[PDB]
Design a protein around this nucleic acid. Sequence first.
RNA 1: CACUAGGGUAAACCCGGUGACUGGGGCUAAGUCGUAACAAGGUAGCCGUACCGGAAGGUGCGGCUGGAAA
RNA 2: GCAGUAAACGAUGAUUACUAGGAGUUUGCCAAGCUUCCACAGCGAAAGCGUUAAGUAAUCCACCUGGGGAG
RNA 3: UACCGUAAGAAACAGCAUCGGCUAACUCUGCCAGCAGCCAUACGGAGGAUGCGAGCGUUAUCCGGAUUUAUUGGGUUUAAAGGGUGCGUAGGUUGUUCGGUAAGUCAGCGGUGAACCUGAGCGCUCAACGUUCAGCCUGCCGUUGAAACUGC
RNA 4: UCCCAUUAGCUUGUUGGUGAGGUAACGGCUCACAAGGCGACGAUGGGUAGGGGAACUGAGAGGUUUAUCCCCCACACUGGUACUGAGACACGGACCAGACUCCUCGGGAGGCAGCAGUGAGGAAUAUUGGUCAAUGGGCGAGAGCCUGAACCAGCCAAG
Lengths: 81, 131, 27, 200, 118, 122
Amino acid sequence: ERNLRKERVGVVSSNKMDKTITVAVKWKEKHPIYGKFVNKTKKYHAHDEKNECGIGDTVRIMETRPLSRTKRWRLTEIIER
Amino acid sequence: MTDPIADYLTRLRNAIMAGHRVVSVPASNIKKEITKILFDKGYILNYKFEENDSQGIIKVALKYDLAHKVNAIKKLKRVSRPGLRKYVGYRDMPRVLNGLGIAIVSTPRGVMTDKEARELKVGGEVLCYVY
Amino acid sequence: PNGKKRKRHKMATHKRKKRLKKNRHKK
Amino acid sequence: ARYTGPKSKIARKFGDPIFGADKVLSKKNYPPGQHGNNRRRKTSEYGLQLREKQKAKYTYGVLEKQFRHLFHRAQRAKGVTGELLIQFLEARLDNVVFRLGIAPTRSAARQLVSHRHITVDGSVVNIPSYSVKPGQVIGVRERSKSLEVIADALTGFNHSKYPWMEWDQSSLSGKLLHMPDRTDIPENIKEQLIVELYSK
Amino acid sequence: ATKIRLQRHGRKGYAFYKIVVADSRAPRDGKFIERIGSYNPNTNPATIDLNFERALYWIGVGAQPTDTARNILSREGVLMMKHLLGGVKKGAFDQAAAENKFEAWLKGKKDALNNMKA
Amino acid sequence: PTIQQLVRKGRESFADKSKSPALNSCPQRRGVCVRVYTTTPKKPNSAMRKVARVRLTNSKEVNAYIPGEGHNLQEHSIVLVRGGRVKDLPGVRYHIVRGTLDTAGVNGRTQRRSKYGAKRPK
RNA sequence: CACUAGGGUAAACCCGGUGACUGGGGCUAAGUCGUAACAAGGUAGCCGUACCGGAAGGUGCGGCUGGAAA
RNA sequence: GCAGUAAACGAUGAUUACUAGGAGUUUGCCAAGCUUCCACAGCGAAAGCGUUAAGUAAUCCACCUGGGGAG
RNA sequence: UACCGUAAGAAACAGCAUCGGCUAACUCUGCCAGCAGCCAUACGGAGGAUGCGAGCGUUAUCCGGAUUUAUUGGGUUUAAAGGGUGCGUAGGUUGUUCGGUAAGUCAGCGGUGAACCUGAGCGCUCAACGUUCAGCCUGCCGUUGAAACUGC
RNA sequence: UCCCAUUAGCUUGUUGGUGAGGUAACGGCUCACAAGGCGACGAUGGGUAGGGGAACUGAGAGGUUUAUCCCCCACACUGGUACUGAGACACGGACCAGACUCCUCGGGAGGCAGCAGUGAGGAAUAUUGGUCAAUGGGCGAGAGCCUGAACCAGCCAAG
Ligand SMILES: [K+]
Ligand SMILES: [K+]
Ligand SMILES: [K+]
Ligand SMILES: [K+]
Ligand SMILES: [Mg+2]
Ligand SMILES: [Mg+2]
Ligand SMILES: [Mg+2]
Ligand SMILES: [Mg+2]
Ligand SMILES: [Mg+2]
Ligand SMILES: [Mg+2]
Ligand SMILES: [Mg+2]
Ligand SMILES: [Mg+2]
Ligand SMILES: [Mg+2]
């Protein structure tokens, strides 16, 4: 009966932080004017308590309360290595 | 090669403009589907698939009106090019020549024309306009 | 291929080069 | 505002005596001014469209803003634009009174409407541009049913032959059956020219 | 507190009111939580349109009506304790039959004779 | 251009410029005449046009053409300046509003009176 | 005792103004000196570069035809 | 060793596929791979281009938006 | 709403050589002017006529035709416009076929999105306007499916 | 979710961690190891602007502006600090520091971006008006009191 916090699927881009990782999520969609489908990425900052992620692994993250200054996500699961 | 479908349309258009009776194209699955649609709608006289050691050859025999020496096909236009892909829903399916032409469209139910696409209520990628 | 079009540019180039050659050696 | 100028000038300028019957239209069939009846210089198609529009306006006593709004209404409505415009022009209260014959001229009908001698559905209506709908009853007000001018105008009007108007002399009133067709309307206005002029 | 009141919405000389549920601090014709009816006082029958279920719900949760809104609610029959009855049930008030009370009062018509014999 | 080129750069639009910039989008302006002089038209036209150098309230110098037959303008006269440029005259892109402030209406006019600030004759 | 608005100091930056004097440009007429281009425009023209002349310009070197004649 | 310009021109960016005829010409065997002139369809405002396109289409890059001021 | 007695208290402004609807006389640099231009079918007055009309003209500002920034929807031999020529980084595009996935794409369901604006009424004597109801929600979000094409 | 690359590097509480304090509340929010974070998918800096729905305009795509109307934000001579309070940028509150202005020899006051006069600036925009009768608001057990919100009237070629 919860309210279903936001979830994202991305690729780890950095792990050189104490229990914090950077996840890049990329996608395609059409240009607002010219209609061409363009690539854009968005970076995140997620909490990893166990430090169980390397670089380039496909991960799933969930939205949480503010855990730091610009750190609003936690690592739910790892889909690929 | 950058756009095999546009190349197939260009081969057909050039053969029509030159007045040829038969045009040979390298074969592909989507090109075979387009040739089948053209034959069903009555734009080409006949077609034949040849499976040689290469990818194969589509041999198309064009249709000329002996009464007026005019080909059955007048315009062939590629819509969704590699540099700009176009997708429409079934509600916004294009109408070609005020319904007197066809719009070959690839849908999740297969490759068909805008008429059956509207009937089955499925959208997809607008391959080309023919009239 | 009228000719006046190139004549105007030729005139402008003459004036600019004369200006530069007069300004040289003066500081 | 109202035109309230000389009428024989407009009658002679347009040829057709749109303001009824007059003795002046004979022996004088030239537009007013010192340059009248000096042949006829070639007037353009735009000039002809303008003269048709002016003929309609002077016929029905309508100024340009109201006429443009009437054209907009006809364009919005469903049917032929010109036929709808002529129907809307004929559906005005003063025109309806004039067709019922309560007053001799359209200007007389407008004066009666303005001075409140005409009732619509039992209530006094004094707006000359009031749009009469079919099924309504337009009659003389009870306090003015014995006016000399109204009695004279109705004298000799025992015909009341208009198919889209039913006249009752006992109640001194009349009713509108339906909107007449343009061919049934007895006006020589070519509405097509006005339509193209206002749409181009 | 939450209130039931009227917003003036007609034009000059012709007032038309929109019966809304709004916070008391809101502007008179501004923000409102919900719209529950309309009120036309110019007509002699004093035209009223009201959403009965929503009005009853707002009264139940505790919206405080203004004087005129309370009068309108009473006229429409929202103000009742038939649901408050803890010792009875199916207590059909049927007061709408008496509240009909159709006031078909009209005026006689008189005319002036036109004696213009000249 | 290609769709990728337009995505990278896009198109550019340039706003136009006012035909009478010294008005600063005001329909008219107030000014003081510096010198009221006479000028010669271009080659195909021969006349002696009456122009005034006007200092507007926004500290701008303009050349304003005085229309009508005769005028009472001198130096240090408060006038109203509106837009409008004369074809043969080069550099004169403003008009003096007759019949307002110091400048009076054109005497003896009967037609086009409102364009020259002439009252209706009794 | 820290914290700080505000004050003084210095610098350096940015934005503006004015200044003896000294340079282009636009527009209008036409005073003066020539005739550079348009015809093979009377030395074919033009492009780049260098030097030189009251000015249009001239000459050297390479290029082009958007040049006749042949 | 600097400098980095040109009527540095086919005044025509690079790839890919397709679409008539004539006349010459270089190279290894009729035929490529070139290199030059008339010329169908088509294109173009016209002069003209025309399988070495300025035709039919697809991909990417460069550039233009009245003249002068002013490169 | 009603009664006295009264046409009585109530029309101007801009055009008139072509485009453009409207014409001749008297004057004459003065001028006019959106353009073609005119020093008189164009300047000023007179008589007429033509637009509009309690307004009519002028100036200022914005939008459309204007495709004059062209995704829809323009171009580059000579009109403005191919970089002197290559190699190459990021980026953009990717022959054919089989099998997955479901990011793009398609479809279904649900939520969300005053006043104004669109058909029908109702009330303002009509109309502007006010008001009610049907027709727009054609964006965003959530959740279920499809697998032809693009992506992996 | 605007322009400038004739703005290419920016950052040291800055990015993360441990703990503590603090707050209605999570948090470098603050305070006592590691070197990370953001950047041609435009960081940083400079310039300009309140943002939407409306409105206007166009066949549409789109473009212009947010005058009146509604929603959100910011502000109350300029800065700083708080107090009171459920709630504070405190719009008819306070303290301090500035500048300006006014009335007084010890000093004391004001802030016109609430409504009406007036002056100035400008091409240009009105009454030092009536009433709380209606709607809304504050307080009161209610009657009621107050309300320059509001409803009206006046002026203005005036859409
Ligand atoms: K060369
Ligand atoms: K592929
Ligand atoms: K309190
Ligand atoms: K009150
Ligand atoms: Mg020279
Ligand atoms: Mg010579
Ligand atoms: Mg020579
Ligand atoms: Mg020499
Ligand atoms: Mg070049
Ligand atoms: Mg009117
Ligand atoms: Mg050129
Ligand atoms: Mg080249
Ligand atoms: Mg407190």
